[PDB]
Symmetry: D2
Subunit: 292 residues, 4 copies
Amino acid sequence: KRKGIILAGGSGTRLHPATLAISKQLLPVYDKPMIYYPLSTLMLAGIREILIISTPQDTPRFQQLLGDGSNWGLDLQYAVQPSPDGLAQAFLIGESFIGNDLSALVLGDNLYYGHDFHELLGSASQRQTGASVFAYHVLDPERYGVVEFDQGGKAISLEEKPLEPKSNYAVTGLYFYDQQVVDIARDLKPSPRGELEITDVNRAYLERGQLSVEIMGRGYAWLDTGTHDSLLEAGQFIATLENRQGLKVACPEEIAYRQKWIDAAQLEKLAAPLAKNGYGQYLKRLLTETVY
Amino acid sequence: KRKGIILAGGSGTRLHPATLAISKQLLPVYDKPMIYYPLSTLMLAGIREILIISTPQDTPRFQQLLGDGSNWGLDLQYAVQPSPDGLAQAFLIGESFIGNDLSALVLGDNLYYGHDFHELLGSASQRQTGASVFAYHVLDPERYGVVEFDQGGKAISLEEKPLEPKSNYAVTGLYFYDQQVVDIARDLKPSPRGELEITDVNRAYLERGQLSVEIMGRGYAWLDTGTHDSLLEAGQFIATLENRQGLKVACPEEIAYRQKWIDAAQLEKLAAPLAKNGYGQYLKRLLTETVY
Amino acid sequence: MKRKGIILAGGSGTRLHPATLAISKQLLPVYDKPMIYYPLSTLMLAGIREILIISTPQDTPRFQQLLGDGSNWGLDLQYAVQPSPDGLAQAFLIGESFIGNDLSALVLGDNLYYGHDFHELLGSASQRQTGASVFAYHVLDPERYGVVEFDQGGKAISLEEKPLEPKSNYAVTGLYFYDQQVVDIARDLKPSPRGELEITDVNRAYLERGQLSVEIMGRGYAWLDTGTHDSLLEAGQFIATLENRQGLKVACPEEIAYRQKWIDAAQLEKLAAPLAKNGYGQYLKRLLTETVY
Amino acid sequence: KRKGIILAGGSGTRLHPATLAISKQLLPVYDKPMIYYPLSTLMLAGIREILIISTPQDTPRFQQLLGDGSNWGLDLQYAVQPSPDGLAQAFLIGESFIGNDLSALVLGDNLYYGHDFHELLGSASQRQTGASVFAYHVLDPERYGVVEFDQGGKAISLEEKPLEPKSNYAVTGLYFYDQQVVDIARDLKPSPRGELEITDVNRAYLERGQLSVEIMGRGYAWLDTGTHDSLLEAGQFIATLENRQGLKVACPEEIAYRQKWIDAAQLEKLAAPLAKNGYGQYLKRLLTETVY
Ligand SMILES: Cc1cn([C@H]2C[C@H](O)[C@@H](COP(=O)(O)OP(=O)(O)O[C@H]3O[C@H](CO)[C@@H](O)[C@H](O)[C@H]3O)O2)c(=O)[nH]c1=O
Ligand SMILES: Cc1cn([C@H]2C[C@H](O)[C@@H](COP(=O)(O)OP(=O)(O)O[C@H]3O[C@H](CO)[C@@H](O)[C@H](O)[C@H]3O)O2)c(=O)[nH]c1=O
Ligand SMILES: Cc1cn([C@H]2C[C@H](O)[C@@H](COP(=O)(O)OP(=O)(O)O[C@H]3O[C@H](CO)[C@@H](O)[C@H](O)[C@H]3O)O2)c(=O)[nH]c1=O
Ligand SMILES: Cc1cn([C@H]2C[C@H](O)[C@@H](COP(=O)(O)OP(=O)(O)O[C@H]3O[C@H](CO)[C@@H](O)[C@H](O)[C@H]3O)O2)c(=O)[nH]c1=O
Ligand SMILES: Cc1cn([C@H]2C[C@H](O)[C@@H](COP(=O)(O)OP(=O)(O)O[C@H]3O[C@H](CO)[C@@H](O)[C@H](O)[C@H]3O)O2)c(=O)[nH]c1=O
Ligand SMILES: Cc1cn([C@H]2C[C@H](O)[C@@H](COP(=O)(O)OP(=O)(O)O[C@H]3O[C@H](CO)[C@@H](O)[C@H](O)[C@H]3O)O2)c(=O)[nH]c1=O
Ligand SMILES: Cc1cn([C@H]2C[C@H](O)[C@@H](COP(=O)(O)OP(=O)(O)O[C@H]3O[C@H](CO)[C@@H](O)[C@H](O)[C@H]3O)O2)c(=O)[nH]c1=O
Ligand SMILES: Cc1cn([C@H]2C[C@H](O)[C@@H](COP(=O)(O)OP(=O)(O)O[C@H]3O[C@H](CO)[C@@H](O)[C@H](O)[C@H]3O)O2)c(=O)[nH]c1=O
């Protein structure tokens, strides 16, 4: 059983004054709230029990939007991160929620998309020992956790936001962990950036020979919605796919239905109040159409 | 003395689930909140005393964002519209705020842009009798209030969302009124579709020969953020201009400064807390650069 | 086994007027490189090195100027003219001598495919040695396309070209793999009510013989076509977003050639040289010393 | 009478490999060939007699697209620039075309748009002395000719592509000249950059107190299609305006009709060949719709 965490707080300075009114994670990516994207990622990984961590001010907003998850066949819980003191804090704030389980963390502003993403997630969720992370070729690796490989394609080092990156492979905001993660996190000291770093967690596993770094190929899209510009680009990306296909990306209701976490009667009840816009009409259609 | 009103309420059924967490009027248009755009419109019209009308739930959000307006040389007040029962309710809700003064109303999701907009506004503002409104050629006039002209260019008829529009000219969401508006609004009954219509207010002035209809030329951009797609397009539009020019659209701080409503010292105090991001850096730069 | 490829890159481009009064739709850019690069890349990724480019009489020399005989990219490119855009199936009549007694593949010039493991999706189809293979893709407006209907078991049961009342939301994309039966099939075709020699009629002949494989191309793949002004803009934006995020380029023939070992490192450095004053040349250079997984 | 020149040559290296296929000025901007835009600019300035200069290979292609211009009420002529040796060569190549007339040069890859652009053009075009150029605030002045002003608003220096710009005002790719330009261009020698510079022509006028630098306000769009990114952005801009308005930008047939250079019957005849598409349909619509 893997438990899931969505880390959806974080500093808002950058996006002010746009996000003076709204935390980044509540802004729409095209036609739905940003949080639906990472939420769908956990769902596609087969995870139904999820802890959403956000700021004292946004946590109540998330609860209002998403409730307890029961309408979607999920178990959502919530916790507050008082200060954005680092990704790895997720595992301290989430210690009691995780228990003795395996886990997965996804970042609030990370959007993934592509063919057979469900299988890629399935493959990582099924390795019960160590940790799995994903490496993606990017233009500006200095902005991210960076992973270096040897001549044989094997991962050999990690560095957080290196001044002189050793590769162009970023470690994306999606992480699968075994039961070792909490104690690793508990032992960390803040980096010089003043954060409790997920890269330090991932390095702990790498130093024990227990970090699986899978390449997320260039056929996938991995987008960061963290700037005004990237938020725009991501909206256009989603729009182009949805308008071409007549299918929506990261509709939790659809995913719950396809996974059999809710039945047709439940989906029909979710479509009603949204019946007057394209979203509800979309849900209704999924009841009478086979989609492969 | 002309007072301003921003009508910033409205139903969110359309934009759900994106606007399930945030109403249309608080969503960013690229890099700043939507309400900054119509606010800037009033400011460019020389209006400093402005009433913001929103939903019960949104008024405190607007208040948090904007305060009393004193930081920007403005006098901002707030009122609530309990149900989106028509644009003309603005004059009932704002009857006391208006007093015996002239007024202007702008719609919360309307974004205007172009060369000599400030002169177009000033001219309408200087007309102390009757009403003034603006007509703009559009592709789908059936979505809007539509104004018909005779062979000599005189406005002859108005119709709200006509099934068979008489022209391709939409009446935009920006209206200037004399003291007659409140009593005209007070005598209106709701339309078949159940709204107290701005088009009916406008028709009352037309039928007395006191409605001025100015053509807003194709050189201007008049956009609305009413839909997912149009918000995306409005974001791209603003981004292209800002990134080309190194100037921002609808920064209230800048407009206030340029209009002499706040001095250099006040502008510097506004920029400090935003100094870590591009918006604060922008305000500071405005103190040392002459922009024509 | 060798399969031979065909790009159908003709037509009038009427929907794109007046932009296509200047150039063939297939020479217009999609973001940073000519549209034709994209379908060409698709054939290359299917392991196909010998490719006939069919175009209008006026545009044929323009493609010859851009691409040449293909030898610098390790390919064998040839050209033939379609006098009038009288149907996709005409590709097999125009290309009959080119095809000879070989397996073939046709890709449409304004079709742009992208996604994870597309390379393997192409290789599975290209490596078959019998029947026809085509791809079904869920779309919003199936009435604009060849449409495939399935029974409750997932089996293809009918094909209709541009149906006013589509039987499903699955379009048959502009990518087709054929065995040696196709030329004789095409030869017996008559113009449809639309006035064309239809690929859909070709595909129905295979279906009738139980020899049509319809593979679903899932929603994780992007299949776009640049037929409208709007569509072409959106395709450019899509490529741009990917390229700017990744530091990698989509459908660079020089890269794909180098990766398939059809050209060597020295060959690539040579291609990069004349292009080095721009970002595209710089990227080719970077590929010589960067391992990309 | 002023005569016009469109410099539509150059290598277009920044656009490789797209411009291996085609001259940059033959590539579409959204819906019509790039060259329509600068052509429309000249036409909007009242100019009917225009010389189009391009490369040896492309000049014939422009002749094929546009012909002798008689069908649009113009007199279009062509000349080859053997090598892209500087904007000022347009005055040498075009020496005989110009004769003893006033002239104007517009760059092939520059796109202007905005309210009262026609009046802005008319003012400059109708002057009968000196040189007129336009200054536009930009984010990256180092890429352009840069004009500096004194405290009084008076232009005091010009630099081409300065590493350390003295201002954020670029001199755009539109230039109006009296009879002095040809002899000025004749005396120029190639710059450090290896080019016969328009900026050198402009400084010759500035030295004699005969350069009018007019500010093109932030209300106007001035874009150029020189990078892949900027060509994309220009296309989206045009698209947004065209789809909102149901009007098209830079349609030569329209402009010619509005200026009375062609009549209705002439216009019907031009739409006929284009009727099966949205562009022909638009021309037809112009015959029976009054557009203010
Ligand atoms: C630091 C911090 C962040 N966050 C949230 C905010 C965002 O949704 C998300 C990521 O924050 P950002 O600030 O975009 O990304 P950043 O924290 O610089 O980088 C992280 O995210 C990258 C992937 O996006 C990784 O490559 C880096 O290794 C990792 O450290 O996590 C929190 O909820 N709490 C925090 O304390
Ligand atoms: C099912 C579903 C998927 N997605 C997103 C998740 C992924 O980013 C992307 C693609 O979904 P995936 O299920 O990973 O892959 P997809 O291309 O649909 O491929 C599936 O469908 C193909 C066609 O039947 C099969 O041949 C593949 O074996 C199968 O994996 O779409 C959604 O946003 N919502 C969904 O309801
Ligand atoms: C009806 C109503 C609307 N609103 C807000 C929501 C939006 O910011 C703005 C406009 O409402 P919408 O419903 O987008 O636009 P719509 O109401 O269809 O039409 C209005 O706005 C159009 C232009 O935007 C005009 O051409 C029409 O004449 C006028 O009736 O007004 C309110 O705040 N309260 C309301 O009662
Ligand atoms: C007439 C015409 C114009 N344009 C371009 C030129 C400009 O970049 C932009 C706006 O055209 P202009 O004629 O400069 O300006 P516009 O905003 O239409 O304003 C005009 O129309 C207004 C409304 O009737 C008048 O109040 C103004 O006096 C008049 O100048 O559109 C075209 O691309 N094609 C056209 O046919
Ligand atoms: C009819 C015809 C087309 N062409 C070129 C033009 C384009 O690159 C490409 C496709 O032409 P279009 O007119 O977009 O596509 P269209 O003929 O409507 O539809 C075809 O392509 C669709 C996929 O794009 C399929 O779903 C249909 O079954 C198929 O008939 O083929 C030619 O070169 N010659 C032709 O005779
Ligand atoms: C190699 C290459 C690919 N492409 C396009 C074709 C596809 O649309 C898209 C993805 O390329 P593909 O090779 O199909 O798939 P990609 O996501 O890179 O996955 C590969 O790379 C993965 C990461 O190492 C491997 O796990 C996979 O087994 C392998 O198939 O990129 C290009 O445009 N140019 C190229 O040079
Ligand atoms: C040098 C040269 C250029 N051209 C064409 C190419 C373009 O359509 C147009 C401009 O060329 P570009 O090289 O993009 O623009 P660039 O030459 O960097 O700069 C010019 O254009 C800038 C405005 O776009 C100005 O601000 C500069 O003062 C001016 O020198 O002229 C020619 O046809 N022949 C030429 O010799
Ligand atoms: C001053 C200012 C303007 N704007 C918006 C309002 C308009 O949509 C657009 C253009 O502003 P306007 O002031 O109406 O027009 P603009 O093009 O700057 O033209 C001005 O500046 C020109 C150049 O000095 C003068 O020749 C004109 O007479 C003058 O009106 O920019 C802002 O968003 N922020 C601002 O601070």
